[PDB]
C-alpha cells in the first residue's frame, strides 16, 4: 500500500505463505479449523524470525573473523516492546507479509496486537537501552546488550475505582518466539561465603553458587543485514527432607524472577543487590572467554568496552578487579588501569533518593570480597585526593566512597566515577548540573573525565513503525534516506508555505486521532469529541514531573467555563497516563485525583464536549506508539532541573505535535533546534529555582495573590471532587501549602497564561500545522543515531558503519 | 542392516537430511562448526517429530467424526523412560534416519545417549502405565493418558562411599521437543474454602484458584499410523508487598514439582493430596468438556470410561459426584448411577502400610465438599451392607470408608471398590488374594465386581528396540507379525532342536553381553568377566523383595570359594540394582551391604575373576533396556504372596534369561506358560506362610540348624564386611533375627540348593540355550496388547482394532 514499508513480489509473498502453513502445521500443531488468532500470529512470528536467523549466524561468524572492538551494554532494564513489526520493518518484509496474511484471509494489524509487550523495564532509562540497541545494530557496531530475564516484567496497571491496583506481567506464560536458550553457556555465579588469606594472595570460599543461563534476542540493524544480540541471564539452581530440598530451589531461582518496579526512591533489599551482582559477575565472565578465544590483558581496553547505564552494575567494577587480581593474578596497579580504560559511567539520576547507597553490612554478608576491594580502591583515591588538595579535609568525607553516619553505605556514584574513564549526563543542561553541583569535587579532580551524550529515540520504531501515515508524506518529498540519517528531516523546511503539504501534515494528525479515538471506545468504552485539541501527559507518575500541575490547570479550565458557560473555549481532550511506583503513596493519590476530576467534569451537562479528562490505563511501549501519533500538544512541565534529560519530549516532536514545557532537560536543546518561537516555553529557569531556595518557597504567598488558585485548593479541601469522603485529598493540599519540593504553585500563573497561548494557535489550523512542520524538521537531532555515533566516537574509540552486510 | 529397523529408501533418506539440516539451522540456529551432540540430537528428535504431527492430527480429527467411547488412564506416574528410538520404531523410520545420520558423519546410536529419561514414575505402577499407552495406541483405542508434569521425576541415584545420594532429575533443563504446551486449555482447579448450604443444593465458595496447564504428548502405535495423546498438567498461580506476592506464586505452582519418590510407605502429606485432587479435578473438566461437545447424563458411561491406576486418582469418584450433583443438577442416585458404571479400579497393592487412608481434618481443610460427600457415599453404602449381612455390625465397621480410632481416616481402598462397577488385580494368585483375605468382604456383597487382569509388556520397547539382534534371528524364521501378536512367538518351539537357531540365540546373549561390559568399564570404570553367568537382580530396594537374600547366597558362594580354593565353579557376574526411598533406612543399609560385600569380594586375589559384585547406579528404564538383554539368570525372589505381579521378571523372559524365583505374582503364570522344567523354582508358597505365621516365626530355628547361615550373621555382626566400623550391620542382623515379616531365613536352604542347579545347567551350553528358546517361545502371553484387549472387552467395551489408519 505505502511505499517505505518495502515491495511485496510475487515469489517473496508466495514464500511467506508456504512457510506460514508450515509453521501452523509442524509448529503449533493445528490446522485451519482449530487455529486461534493467537496460533496465527505465533505463525507469522516464527516465519519472520526464519528470515533473521541467517543473518544473525553470519553476523557472529564476521565479528569472529574481524575482531573488532567489542560493546557491552550493561543494564538492569531493557525496555522493548513489541518485536514483530519492528522486525518486518528492519528487515523490508513489512508490505510482503501483509500481502501474505490478506491472502490466507487474515489482518496482520489484529495479529500484531496479540503480542505481549517485553515489558522488562520501567520507564526512561530502560526505553532508552532499547533504542540504543536498535541504533547500535544499525550503525553497524559489534554490540551486545545483557541484562536480566525477568519472569515478570513492569506490573499491568488496572484501575478500580480510581484507585491503581497492581497485577503481575505474566509475558512468558505463552512463549516467546523471539529467544533462544543457551543452556550450554551456563556459568556460575557466587554469594556469601568467606575471604582467606593466603601467601597466593586473598581467596573467596564457602560460597552458595547459583546457575546464569543465557537466553539470546535478536537485534536486527536497519536494512544492513546486521543482527546484533541481546543476551538476558535467568537464574537456576544447581542440581545438589528430599521434597523440601528440591522446593527449596526456588529461592536461588528467585534472582530473575520479578523485575523492581521502583524508579523514584533508593530501598536497600538484598534481592535487588544480588540481581546487580548476579547480571554482573555473569556477564563479565562471558566478556573474558570471548576475549580470551580472540593472557595480555593490556589489549583488554582495545578490544573491549564495558558501559554502565547508571550505577545498577556498578559492581562490574570491584568484580573486574577482583578476576583481574585474584584469578589471573595482574598486580593491582595493572589491573586498576585495565578496568578505567574499560569502564564508562551514564548517570540518569539527579534526586539524591534515587541515588544507590548500599549498607556496608549486606555488601559484607553477600560480597566479602567485593568489600574489600572497594575499601581499597577508596583507600589508594583518597590519597590522591589528599595530594591534589592538601589539606582539605572536608573534600576527603565528602568525595568518599565509604558515607559515615549510623549505618555506614557505599556510594556507589562515587564508586562509577573513580572507576571509569568517562562520565557523562544525557543532555548539555544535565551535564552542566554534574559538572556544578553533585559531582563538582570531582570534576576539579579530573576535568577530562565528564561529557554530554543528549539522549534521543529511534526513529524506527518511533517514525515508521507507528506512523507510517507521517513516514510516507515525507518521503514522498525528500525520499526514504533520513529513515537512517534524520538530519535529513531539514529539508522539510522548504515545504512550510506548501499547501499540499500543510493539507496532508494536518491530515494524518486527524486519521491517527480518529483511529485513536476509536481504540478508546472499543478497547475502554470511552467517547471523546475527535475535534478537540489532544492534550497529552504521559510517563511514569512522580511529583517532579508535575501531574498535578496539569490537574490545576485543568480544574481551571473547568472552573472557567462554568463561571461563563456561552463563552467560546477550544475544546480539549486532556489525557494523563502512567504507572505509579506500588509504594508511593503520593503517586497513588495523584492518579486518584486525575480519575475524579473526571469523574466530575466528564459528567458536567454544561460542559459538553468541551472538555474531557481521561486517564490512560497501563501506560507501556505499545500504548506510547499509539496516543503519541494522536497528539497535538506534549506535556514536558517538570521543575527545572530535575528531568534529568526526558524522551517521550522527543517522541512528539518527531510525530507533529507540539510542546509546552519547562526549560529543563533535552527541551531546552529542542527549543533551542525549533526555534524558541515554535515552542511553548513557560516558568522559572534553573537559576530561579536556585533564587526561590535562598529566600525559601512560600507557597501560601500564591495561595493569597491568586483567586482562581485559592478557589481550586478550596475546592479539593471541602470535597467538591469526592463528595462521599469530603477529607480525601487532604495529603496533597498539605503538600501542596507546606511541603511541595517542586513548586507547583510557583509555575501555576505562566503555566495557564501560556496554556491560553497554545489555544490561540490551535484557532488557526494553518499556522498551528506550519509550526508543526518547523518542529518535525528539526527534530533530526534526537536520533539515537547521533547520540550512538557520538558515545562510539568520544567514549569506545570505534567507528560507526552504515555498510551492508551480504545477503 | 537388519530387516525389522524398516526400509531406508533413497527418497526418504534424502528429505531427512534436508530436514536434519533445516532444524539445526532455523530451529536450533547453529552451523556445523559450532553444533555439538547435543544439537545433533535435537535435529534428529525435531526430524522425527515432524512426521507424528500429521498423523496426530488426523488422528485426533478421526475420533471427532466418528464419536468412539474414549478411555482415560488417570495415574500419577507414567514412567516413559525415552522416546526417540521408540517414535523411530513405531514409524518405520529407524533405518533410514540411521542411513540418514550415518550420511551426515554422525552416529546415531551416540545420539540416542543424550536424550534424557523421562522418569515421571518409580517403578511398577508408572512403567505399567507408560506399556499401557502404547498398547492402546497399536490396538487403535480413543485413549488418553492423563497425569502431573512433574518438573523433577525419580532422583538420580550417586553411590558415595557406598552410600545412595540423592540428586534432583532437571530432565526439563535442556527442554523437552516432544511436548506440546497447550496455554489455551488452562483449567481452574479449587482448594480449601468452605460449604454454603442453599434452597438450591449446596455451594463450594472463599476457594483458591490454580490453573492446571496442560502439556500434550503423542504417542504412537505401531506401524498403524494412530496417534494418541498423553495430557500431563503443570500447576500456574492466577495473575491476581508487591515482590513478595509475585514471589509467593511458587506456593501454588509447587504442587507439579516433584514426583513424591515413596513406593512402599505411606505418608498423609498435604501437598501429596493437592497433586492427587490437582490431576483429577482438571481431567474431569477436560473430559466432560469433551463429551458435551460431542445434557443427557444417561449416556456418559457410553461414551466415557475412567481407569484408576490404584487409589491416588480416587478422587475422581466424589469429584464426579460433585459435579454431576452441584453444578449439573442431576438427583443423587442418578449421578452415582453414572459414576459407578464409568468408574474401574486397578490395586497394585498388598502391604497394608502402603494404603491410602487420608486424616479426616486434612479433607476437611483442602476440601470440604469432598468429605461430606463420601460421608454420604459410605451412608449409603452401609445401608446395603446391614440390609444384605442383618445383624453383622463387625461386617459394618470393616466394610466403612471411615476409619475410626485417634485420628480418623478415610480408606481410599474401600471408596475405589464402592464407586467402581470393576476391581481387578494384576495377576491371577493377587487377584484371588483380594477376594479371599483384603477385600474379602467386599467381594461376599458384590461378587461380579472382582476380575483378574494379568499384567505385561510391550514388546516394542522391551524386545524390538532394546534387543534388535533377538528381533531379527526370531523375524528370520517366522516373519514380522509376532511384534503386534506376541502369540506367533510358540512358533519358536518348533526350533528348539535346530542347531543353526540354538548357535544364534546364543550368540545374540553373547554379543549383548560384550556391548554391557564394555559400557560398564567407559562409564563406571569397572572390568567384568564376559563368560560368568550374568546373575542380574535389578527394581526397587524393598525387603519383600529381598535382596538380602541375595546377599545371603552371593555370601555362601564366596565361603565356598574361600574353603576349597582350588575346586571349580560355574563364574558369575552378580549385578544389583535399584534405587531406595530416601526416607527408608532398611533400604538404605542393604544397599550399603550390596556394595560392602563388593569391596570385599571383588578384591580377593583368592577368588580371581570367578565372582564379582557390582551394584548397578540409577537404575531407571534405559538402564533396563542395556542389562536385561545381556542377563542370563534373572533374580525374582519376593516372599509368596508380596509382589502383586511383578513385570521385570517378563522383560527378562521376553530376552532370553532364564528365571529363579519363588511361586509369587506372575512367576506362577510364567512357569506356568513354560513349564516347570524350565523354570527354577524354590521356596514357600503362599500356604507355607501362613502355616508359619499361624506357628510363629522363629529365625533363630534356622541359625541354629544351618552351619552355613550361622558363618554369615556371625561376619556381618563381627564386622568381616566393615573393618573400620565393626558394628555397621547390626539393625540388619538385628531385623533379621527378631524383626523379619518376610522370612529371609526361612527360603535361604531351598533358595542355595536351586542356585546350585542353576550352575550345573549353566555348564551345558546347549541345555541351557534350549530351555532359554522354550521360555522365550511362551513368553506371548505377558504382552501388554493382550492385557489392554481383556481391559477393553471386560471392563471398558470398547473392541480392540489393529487396522491402519490412512498415511
Ligand atoms: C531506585 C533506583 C534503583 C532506581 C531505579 C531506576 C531508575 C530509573 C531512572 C530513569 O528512568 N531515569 C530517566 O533516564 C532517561 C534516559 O536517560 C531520562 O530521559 C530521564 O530524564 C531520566 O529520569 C532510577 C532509580
Ligand atoms: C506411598 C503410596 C502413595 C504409593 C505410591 C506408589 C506405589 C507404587 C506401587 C507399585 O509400583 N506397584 C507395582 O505395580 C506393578 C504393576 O501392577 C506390579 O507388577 C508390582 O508387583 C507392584 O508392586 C505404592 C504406594
Redesign the interface.
Request: glycine letters at 8%.
Given at each position: 500500500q505505502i511505499s517505505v514499508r518495502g515491495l511485496a513480489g510475487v515469489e517473496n509473498v508466495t514464500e511467506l505463505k508456504k512457510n506460514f502453513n508450515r509453521h501452523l502445521?509442524?509448529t503449533l500443531?493445528?490446522?485451519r479449523n482449530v487455529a486461534?488468532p493467537?496460533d496465527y500470529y505465533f505463525a507469522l512470528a516464527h516465519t519472520v524470525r526464519?528470515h533473521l536467523?541467517?543473518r544473525?549466524?553470519r553476523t557472529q561468524?564476521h565479528y569472529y573473523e574481524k575482531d573488532p572492538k567489542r560493546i557491552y551494554y550493561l543494564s538492569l532494564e531493557f525496555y522493548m516492546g513489541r518485536t514483530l513489526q519492528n522486525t518486518m520493518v528492519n528487515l523490508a518484509l513489512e508490505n510482503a507479509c501483509d500481502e501474505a496474511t490478506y491472502q490466507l484471509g487474515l489482518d496482520m494489524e489484529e495479529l500484531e496486537e496479540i503480542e505481549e509487550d517485553a515489558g522488562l523495564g520501567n520507564g526512561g532509562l530502560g526505553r532508552l537501552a532499547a533504542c540504543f540497541l536498535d541504533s547500535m545494530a544499525t550503525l553497524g557496531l559489534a554490540a551486545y546488550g545483557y541484562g536480566i530475564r525477568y519472569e515478570?516484567g513492569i506490573?499491568?496497571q488496572k484501575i478500580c475505582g480510581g484507585w491503581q491496583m497492581?497485577?503481575?506481567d505474566?509475558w512468558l506464560?505463552?512463549?516467546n518466539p523471539w529467544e533462544?536458550?543457551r543452556?550450554?553457556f551456563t556459568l556460575p555465579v557466587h554469594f556469601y561465603g568467606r575471604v582467606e588469606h593466603t601467601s597466593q594472595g586473598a581467596k573467596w570460599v564457602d560460597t552458595q553458587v547459583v546457575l546464569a543461563m543465557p537466553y539470546?534476542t535478536p537485534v536486527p540493524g536497519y536494512r544492513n543485514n546486521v543482527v546484533n544480540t541481546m543476551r538476558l541471564w535467568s537464574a537456576?539452581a544447581p542440581?545438589?527432607?528430599?521434597?523440601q530440598?528440591?522446593?527449596d530451589?526456588?529461592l536461588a531461582e528467585?534472582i530473575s524472577?520479578?523485575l523492581?518496579?521502583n524508579d523514584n526512591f533508593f530501598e536497600g533489599?538484598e534481592?535487588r543487590l544480588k540481581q546487580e551482582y548476579f547480571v554482573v559477575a555473569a556477564t563479565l565472565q562471558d566478556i573474558i572467554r570471548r576475549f580470551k578465544s580472540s593472557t595480555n590483558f593490556d589489549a583488554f581496553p582495545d578490544k573491549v568496552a564495558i558501559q554502565l547505564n547508571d550505577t545498577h552494575p556498578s559492581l562490574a567494577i570491584p568484580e573486574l578487579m577482583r578476576v583481574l587480581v585474584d584469578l589471573e593474578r595482574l598486580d593491582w596497579d595493572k589491573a586498576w588501569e585495565v578496568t578505567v580504560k574499560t569502564c564508562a559511567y551514564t548517570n540518569h539520576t539527579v534526586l539524591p533518593e534515587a541515588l544507590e547507597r548500599w549498607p556496608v553490612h549486606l555488601l559484607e554478608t553477600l560480597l566479602p570480597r567485593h568489600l574489600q576491594i572497594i575499601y581499597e580502591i577508596n583507600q589508594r583515591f583518597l590519597n590522591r585526593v589528599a595530594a591534589a588538595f592538601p589539606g582539605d579535609v572536608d573534600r576527603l568525607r565528602r568525595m568518599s566512597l565509604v558515607e559515615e553516619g549510623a549505618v555506614k553505605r557505599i556510594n556507589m556514584a562515587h564508586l562509577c566515577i573513580a572507576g571509569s574513564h568517562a562520565v557523562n549526563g544525557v543532555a548539555r543542561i544535565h551535564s552542566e548540573i554534574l559538572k556544578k553541583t553533585i559531582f563538582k569535587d570531582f570534576y576539579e579532580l579530573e576535568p577530562h573525565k565528564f561529557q554530554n551524550k543528549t539522549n534521543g529515540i529511534t526513529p524506527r520504531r518511533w517514525l515508521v513503525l507507528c506512523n507510517p501515515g507521517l513516514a510516507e508524506i515525507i518521503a514522498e518529498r525528500i525520499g526514504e534516506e533520513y529513515i537512517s540519517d534524520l538530519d535529513q528531516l531539514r529539508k522539510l523546511l522548504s515545504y512550510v508555505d506548501d499547501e499540499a503539504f500543510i493539507r496532508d501534515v494536518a491530515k494524518v494528525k486527524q486519521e491517527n486521532k480518529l483511529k485513536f479515538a476509536a481504540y478508546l471506545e472499543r478497547e475502554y468504552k470511552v467517547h471523546i469529541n475527535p475535534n478537540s485539541l489532544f492534550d497529552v501527559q504521559v510517563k511514569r507518575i512522580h511529583e517532579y514531573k508535575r501531574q498535578l500541575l496539569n490537574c490545576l490547570h485543568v480544574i481551571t479550565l473547568y472552573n472557567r467555563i462554568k463561571k461563563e458557560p456561552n463563552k467560546f473555549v477550544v475544546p480539549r481532550t486532556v489525557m494523563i497516563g502512567g504507572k505509579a511506583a506500588?509504594?508511593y503513596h503520593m503517586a497513588k493519590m495523584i492518579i486518584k485525583l486525575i480519575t475524579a476530576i473526571g469523574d466530575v467534569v466528564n459528567h458536567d451537562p454544561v460542559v459538553g464536549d468541551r472538555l474531557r479528562v481521561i486517564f490512560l490505563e497501563n501506560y507501556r511501549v505499545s500504548l506510547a506508539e499509539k496516543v503519541i501519533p494522536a497528539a497535538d500538544l506534549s506535556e514536558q512541565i517538570s521543575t527545572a532541573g530535575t528531568e534529568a534529560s526526558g524522551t517521550g519530549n522527543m517522541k512528539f516532536m518527531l510525530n507533529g505535535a507540539l510542546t509546552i514545557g519547562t526549560m529543563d532537560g533535552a527541551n531546552v536543546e529542542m527549543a533551542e533546534e525549533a526555534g524558541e518561537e515554535n515552542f511553548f516555553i513557560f516558568g522559572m529557569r534553573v537559576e530561579d529555582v536556585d533564587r526561590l531556595d535562598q529566600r525559601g518557597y512560600n507557597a501560601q504567598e500564591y495561595y493569597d495573590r491568586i483567586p482562581e488558585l485559592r478557589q481550586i485548593i478550596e475546592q479539593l479541601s471541602s470535597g467538591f471532587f469526592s463528595p462521599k469522603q469530603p477529607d480525601l485529598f487532604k495529603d496533597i493540599v498539605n503538600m501542596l501549602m507546606h511541603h511541595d519540593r517542586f513548586k507547583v504553585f510557583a509555575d501555576y500563573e505562566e503555566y495557564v497564561k501560556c496554556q491560553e497561548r497554545v489555544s490561540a494557535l490551535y484557532k488557526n489550523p494553518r499556522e498551528w500545522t506550519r509550526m508543526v512542520i518547523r518542529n518535525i524538521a528539526t527534530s533530526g537531532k534526537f536520533s539515537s543515531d547521533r547520540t550512538i555515533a557520538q558515545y562510539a566516537r568520544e567514549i569506545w574509540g570505534v567507528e560507526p558503519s552504515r555498510q551492508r552486510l551480504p545477503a
Open positions: 502445521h509442524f500443531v493445528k490446522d486461534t493467537r526464519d536467523v541467517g544473525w549466524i561468524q515478570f506490573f499491568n497492581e497485577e503481575a505474566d506464560r505463552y512463549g533462544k536458550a543452556p550450554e539470546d537456576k542440581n545438589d527432607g528430599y521434597i530440598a528440591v522446593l530451589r526456588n528467585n524472577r520479578v523492581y518496579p533489599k534481592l506500588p509504594g
